[PDB]
């Protein structure tokens, strides 16, 4: 049950005025992420739709650092012999990795301003 075009259109329109990482944007994006239960691929699509290449790159770097610390510590469900967290989160049998990816994503995007 992935999102459709209308959901993305509403998500972008409702937060057109606000700035990335504002409380309003964080509310709406967090609700979307917690409601649709998407993988990393869909999150990348959503970010490409919402913010430009500059904000995309900044979030990419911040999320790289956050994932770096998180999975360098060692995580309950992460096994580094199978692939990067971006790929484990895309397997529907690793929901723990998917939820960790979602939370790192939202925190990274919130850490912009």
Residue numbers in the entry: 13 to 125
Authors' text:
The retroviral structural protein Gag forms the immature protein shell of nascent virus particles. All retroviral Gag proteins contain three canonical domains: matrix (MA), capsid (CA), consisting of independently folded N-terminal (CA-NTD) and C-terminal (CA-CTD) domains, and nucleocapsid (NC). During immature virus particle formation, these domains function in membrane binding, viral lattice self-assembly and viral genomic RNA (vgRNA) packaging, respectively. Our results show that HTLV-1 uses a distinct CA-NTD arrangement to form the immature Gag lattice and that, in contrast to other retroviral structures, the CA-NTD is the key determinant of immature HTLV-1 assembly.
To gain insight into the immature architecture of HTLV-1, we used cryo-ET to visualize mammalian cell-derived Gag-based VLPs. The CA layer exhibited a regular organization; hence, we used subtomogram averaging to obtain higher-resolution information for this layer. However, to account for the observed heterogeneity of HTLV-1 Gag VLP shapes, we applied local C2 symmetry during subtomogram averaging. The resulting maps had a CA-CTD layer that was resolved to a lower resolution than the CA-NTD layer, which we predict is because of heterogeneity caused by flexibility of the CA-CTD. In contrast, the CA-NTD did not show increased heterogeneity. Therefore, we used both domains as independent species in a multiparticle refinement using the software M34. This approach yielded 5.9-Å and 6.2-Å resolution maps of the CA-NTD and CA-CTD layers, respectively. The CA-NTD establishes lateral interactions that form two basic building blocks shaping the lattice: a CA-NTD trimer and a CA-NTD hexamer. The trimer is formed by interactions spanning residues in helices 4 and 5. Similarly, the hexamerization interface involves helices 1, 2 and 3 of two neighboring monomers (annotated I and I′ in Fig. 1e,h).
